[PDB]
């Protein structure tokens, strides 16, 4: 067994090249995430992976959760996702279509941004686990130590896990309420919508919802139950959303940055009525919103009046840091 993976990688690369052709419409995109930057970016990185592994004693061990297993799943998913984009914006292209695909607020536009985000996340994961094509998943270090401790004691050297096993493991540390809560969490953690959670995906989430002792609490209070939290939005979408709230200076919404993974992008309307977006480093989100509230910048989630009191959570988070 030497050539299956190579064929897989080649199949993917060709498909990315073919999909790049279908993204012929000018209105794409071009602000990050842009499928048009991402596709050839991801293609070349795949070539490097292909090439780095012709000549490989590596990387790492090769049971489930190793590099070979990771790629099997990763490529399968990339292909799946590519088909969805194929179906959305055919054909070669042909003319200039579809007009709805680029109306702010439209459904297709959202379907497209969500796919564009998935591609950004798919590339980010590969770049993190195979920098320059060279696998480091057996050595990768999570940013928050307690997260790191967890991942290595639970998962060992593995870089990737099926959702079910991951949930079970996370559960024995922070209990995950079954049903709609467990589903919401899965949707938040599984950035690639692959059915598996990578050491990278986990790095993103544990950074976003630090500190560790309140991991799920933060996710629950600041994402699931906060009206200012906007799951999986692009920058341009934020700009579009807040257009209505330009009346109410102090209106704000937040989401994960797409280009600085692990970090938040707060979007607020200024005094002037200008829509500004800022990425804070590197505080918990509870600290970020409290200070922005206390300074008059972050007052009205989604342009609405009910701003959850986070006083206790913020205090709790400083205590645990």
């Amino acid at each position: 067994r030497q050539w299956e993976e190579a064929r897989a990688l080649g199949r993917a690369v060709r498909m990315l090249q073919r999909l790049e052709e279908q993204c012929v419409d000018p209105r794409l995109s071009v602000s990050p995430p842009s499928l048009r930057d991402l596709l050839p970016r991801t293609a070349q990185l795949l070539r490097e992976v292909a090439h780095s592994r012709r000549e490989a004693g590596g990387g790492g061990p090769g049971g489930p959760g190793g590099s070979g297993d990771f790629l099997l799943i990763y490529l399968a998913n990339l292909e799946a996702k590519s088909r969805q984009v194929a179906a959305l914006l055919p054909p070669r292209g042909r003319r200039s279509a579809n007009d709805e695909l680029f109306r702010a607020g439209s459904r297709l536009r959202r379907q497209l941004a969500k796919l564009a985000i998935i591609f950004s996340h798919m590339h980010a994961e590969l770049h993190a686990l195979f920098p320059g094509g060279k696998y480091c998943g057996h050595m990768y270090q999570l940013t928050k130590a307690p997260a790191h401790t967890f991942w290595r004691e639970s998962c060992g050297a593995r870089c990737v896990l099926p959702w079910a096993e991951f949930e079970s493991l996370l559960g024995t540390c922070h209990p995950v309420e079954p049903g709609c809560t467990a589903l919401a969490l899965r949707t938040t953690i599984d950035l690639t919508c692959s059915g598996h959670v990578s050491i990278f995906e986990f790095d993103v989430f544990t950074r976003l919802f630090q500190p560790w002792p309140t991991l799920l609490k933060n996710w629950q209070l600041l994402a699931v139950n906060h009206p200012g939290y906007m799951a999986f939005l692009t920058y341009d979408e934020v700009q579009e959303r807040l257009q209505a709230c330009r009346d109410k200076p102090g209106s704000y919404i937040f989401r994960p940055s797409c280009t600085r993974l692990g970090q938040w992008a707060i979007g607020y309307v200024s005094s002037d009525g200008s829509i500004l977006q800022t990425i804070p480093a590197n505080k918990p989100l509870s600290q970020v919103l409290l200070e922005g509230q206390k300074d008059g910048f972050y007052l009205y989630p989604d342009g609405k009046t009910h701003n959850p009191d986070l006083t206790e959570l913020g205090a709790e988070n400083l205590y645990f840091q």
Partner: peptide
């Protein structure tokens, strides 16, 4: 314009 403005909390 620049994309991501300065943190307004300092």
């Amino acid at each position: 314009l620049q994309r991501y403005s300065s943190d307004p909390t300092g």
